[PDB]
Design a protein around this nucleic acid. Structure first.
Ligand code: MG
Ligand code: MG
Ligand code: MG
Ligand code: MG
Lengths: 68, 199, 57, 227, 118
RNA sequence: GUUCCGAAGGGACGGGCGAUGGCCUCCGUUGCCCUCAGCCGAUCGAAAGGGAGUCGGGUUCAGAUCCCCGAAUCCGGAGUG
RNA sequence: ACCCGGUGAGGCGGGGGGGCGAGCCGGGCUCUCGCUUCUGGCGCCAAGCGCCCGGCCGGCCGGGCGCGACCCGCUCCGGGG
């Protein structure tokens, strides 16, 4: 299964690949608003192990919190 | 102790500016293609007085180059201007009182009013009655100009921001002594609530 | 009259029979006519002088 | 011969002279935030130094061979739901009175087939919107020795199956009449992808400036070249 | 196509009409302020008598919700008499006193005898 | 916070298409398309500011430019005008 | 990236093409410019040219597309960083 490979990918956050992904995604999220529905989870494996299913009735909201 | 008066002035309760009878913001026209490449002209329709400001304002009419309209604007009236006069706006308008053109084109030693401190700001510097700035020297590479401000300071300015030729009208206003507290009271009533100062 | 009364009036009691009737006075009307005509004549003159100079050069 | 009353009236669009015509302004419009964001995301992709593991998806299978790939895949389409209904009825009457080879869709199915070496070639869509779901798959395919190609369009890749989208498909078993065509496709694809993976893993991307910046740099370097 | 204006503006989409799959409430509300509950009873004071004898009017009191049009329609239906005009005032007690002037070809005194107030 | 980081308009002369009623004439209701379209920001804020158009005589116990009589006037509407 | 200013985010960067100069044997090269300055007037909703098409009877009536108004581009233009 690909979910395991995605799991080690996301555990290698300091790698240049994941660092590039995180930088680009953070820029885009910052450009968006503070509270908006995502069309689908960004981390499907993490969502699945947190209890998300690809069914009608599960929604995902991407939200931004001020730091400090 | 208590909050002091100079500390209360920043809350803006009774220390806001009295701005009902003011005629608008005195701003140069927005930069555009015509002003950046050639020029356009306008007729000086009115010369009016707004409360709280020493300099008079010139109400000028241009014609919109993109649709069938006429645009009205308010300039800080340079001294010597008059109604029925044509004022020219743009890069290559010739150099005479009332015109506005970038400071990088005018020769050194030029007297200027309503100087624009950053390009596009529509005039910020030397716009009080009788004040002016001087174009000291140019620098083509890096496109920068030295300007002497009415405070005696010298500043480096981008050579592509506009400026009105001439001195601001209404000069010599502070040479007349206010003879009485009534005159001072009326002077500051049209500006804000700060006059009767206590030691 | 007070401005909202002008609805009841007829047109002849509101304007005069002339170009810019009831909106601009006769003196400035005639100066506008003269100015437009003489300006256009001067423009024709400068155009023909420009053409003559182009031919000369 | 015609009316002298017909004359032309040229209109001079000089500075200040006349009102300009309504020309095209599509590159000066104030666009909505979503359009602006989605355009400058691509601009950012072209700016930044993209690591080779993400760069590798830009180098894509060419159109001319992709058409044979798709026409061969069109034979092994999985059954539509109505076709499955027909066959389920049909088995019902034949019981009341062999599994043809097909494509295997889904990143999970494809990756488990590849790591079991049950796959014969793998087609990967080039633009999965988290790239991380497929970014690891070319290297895995190389080490298992399975030929892989990168195809334009998850939409047209999932048009093979009868769904909206599909990330990867896998040829795992075909018929005799298509073994030769599959062999030709596999040899071409392995020459293009499998045998270059050193340069694929060491080929960075992006790092190209804007047209205005590169033009200004070109003018400056031309000046210094002349003198 | 081309864009001649530098402003993007929201395009005009299509808005369907309600096609409800069941009425929200089952039945229409019965008209409660009808011609019988709209006029309650007429005044029979000395002022009302003088008004009916002199001005050829009638005097009723009604609930505060009635319009002059509603009042005159109700008077026409209940007493089959034509009405010239209506003047209403909300009395300090709370009801709405209505002076209803009839068409000249009817007689207020006759209508009052018919109704029963005199 | 009140125009500031909004895809902030549900309007319109007209033209075309589609249906309808009325002596299917001509128009109207519309339904779709083409074309035209800055607003300074929803909304609240004055019984002394802005704001069309009613006056005279008589009448009660207590109401009158309000009721009765007589003279007016404004606004809106009107297929067939 | 991030920050500031302006606008109804209206002509930005290259390239072409054309005119005026300078100099070299009708030629290319570098540079430059592209139309508004005597007057308190007017200026929009295309003339013109070219290519198609339709309806009625060569004529009448009614449409469409392009040049006029150059092309290609990835940051709305500038200033910081
Ligand atoms: Mg005080
Ligand atoms: Mg008259
Ligand atoms: Mg109100
Ligand atoms: Mg009032």
């Amino acid at each position: 299964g690909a979910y395991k490979y995605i799991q080690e990918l996301w555990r290698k956050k300091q790698s240049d690949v994941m660092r590039f992904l995180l930088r680009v995604r953070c820029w885009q999220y910052r450009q968006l608003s503070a509270l908006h529905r995502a069309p689908r989870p960004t981390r499907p494996d993490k969502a699945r192990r947190l209890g998300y299913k690809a069914k009608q009735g599960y929604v995902i909201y991407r939200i931004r919190v001020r730091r400090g | 102790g208590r909050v002091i008066r100079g500390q209360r002035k920043g809350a803006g309760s009774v220390f806001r500016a009295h701005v009902k009878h003011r005629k608008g913001a005195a701003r140069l026209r927005a930069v555009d293609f015509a002003e950046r490449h050639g020029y356009i002209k306008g007729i000086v329709k009115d010369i009016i007085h707004d409360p709280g400001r020493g300099a008079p304002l010139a109400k000028v009419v241009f014609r919109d180059p993109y649709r069938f309209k006429k645009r009205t604007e308010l300039f800080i009236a340079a001294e010597g201007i008059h109604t029925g006069q044509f004022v020219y706006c743009g890069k290559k308008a010739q150099l005479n009182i009332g015109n506005v053109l970038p400071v990088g084109t005018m020769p050194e030693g030029t007297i200027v009013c309503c100087l624009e401190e950053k390009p596009g700001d529509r005039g910020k510097l030397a716009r009080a009655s009788g004040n002016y700035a001087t174009v000291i020297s140019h620098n083509p590479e890096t496109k920068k100009t030295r300007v002497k401000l009415p405070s005696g300071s010298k500043k480096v300015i981008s050579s592509a921001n506009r400026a009105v030729v001439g001195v601001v009208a209404g000069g010599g206003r502070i040479d007349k002594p206010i003879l009485k507290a009534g005159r001072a009271y009326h002077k500051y009533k049209a500006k804000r609530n700060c006059w009767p100062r206590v030691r | 009259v007070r401005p909202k009364v002008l609805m009841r009036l007829s047109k002849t009691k509101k304007h005069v029979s002339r170009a810019y009737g009831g909106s601009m006075c006769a003196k400035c009307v005639r100066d506008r006519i003269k100015r437009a005509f003489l300006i256009e004549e001067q423009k024709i003159v400068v155009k023909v002088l420009k053409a003559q100079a182009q031919s000369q050069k | 011969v015609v009316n002298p009353l017909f004359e032309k009236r040229p209109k001079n669009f000089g500075i200040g002279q006349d009102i300009q015509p309504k020309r095209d302004l599509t590159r000066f419009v104030k666009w909505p935030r979503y359009i602006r964001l989605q355009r400058q995301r691509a601009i950012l992709y072209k700016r930044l130094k993209v690591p080779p593991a993400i760069n590798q998806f830009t180098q894509v299978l060419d159109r001319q061979t992709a058409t044979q790939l798709l026409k061969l895949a069109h034979k092994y389409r999985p059954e539509t739901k109505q076709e499955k209904k027909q066959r389920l009825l049909a088995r019902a009457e034949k019981k009341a009175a062999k599994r043809p080879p097909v494509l295997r869709a889904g990143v999970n199915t494809v990756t488990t087939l590849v790591e079991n070496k049950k796959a014969q070639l793998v087609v990967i869509a080039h633009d999965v919107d988290p790239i991380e779901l497929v970014v690891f798959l070319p290297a895995l395919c190389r080490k298992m020795g399975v030929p892989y190609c990168i195809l334009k369009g998850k939409a047209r890749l999932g048009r093979l199956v009868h769904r909206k989208t599909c990330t990867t498909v896998a040829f795992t078993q075909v018929n005799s009449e298509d073994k030769g065509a599959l062999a030709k496709l596999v040899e071409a694809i392995r020459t293009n992808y499998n045998d270059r993976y050193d340069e694929i893993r060491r080929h960075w991307g992006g790092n190209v400036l804007g047209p205005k910046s590169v033009a200004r740099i070109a003018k400056l370097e031309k000046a210094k070249a002349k003198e | 196509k081309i864009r001649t204006s530098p402003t993007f503006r929201r395009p005009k989409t299509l808005r369907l009409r309600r096609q409800p799959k069941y009425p929200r409430k089952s039945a229409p509300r019965r008209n409660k302020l009808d011609h019988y509950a709209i006029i309650k009873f007429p005044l029979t004071t000395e002022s009302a008598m003088k008004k009916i004898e002199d001005n050829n009017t009638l005097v009723f009191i009604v609930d505060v919700k009635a319009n002059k049009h509603q009042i005159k329609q109700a008077v026409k239906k209940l007493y089959d008499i034509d009405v010239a005009k209506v003047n209403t005032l909300i009395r300090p007690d709370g009801e709405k006193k209505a002076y209803v002037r009839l068409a000249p070809d009817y007689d207020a005194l006759d209508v009052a005898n018919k109704i029963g107030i005199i």
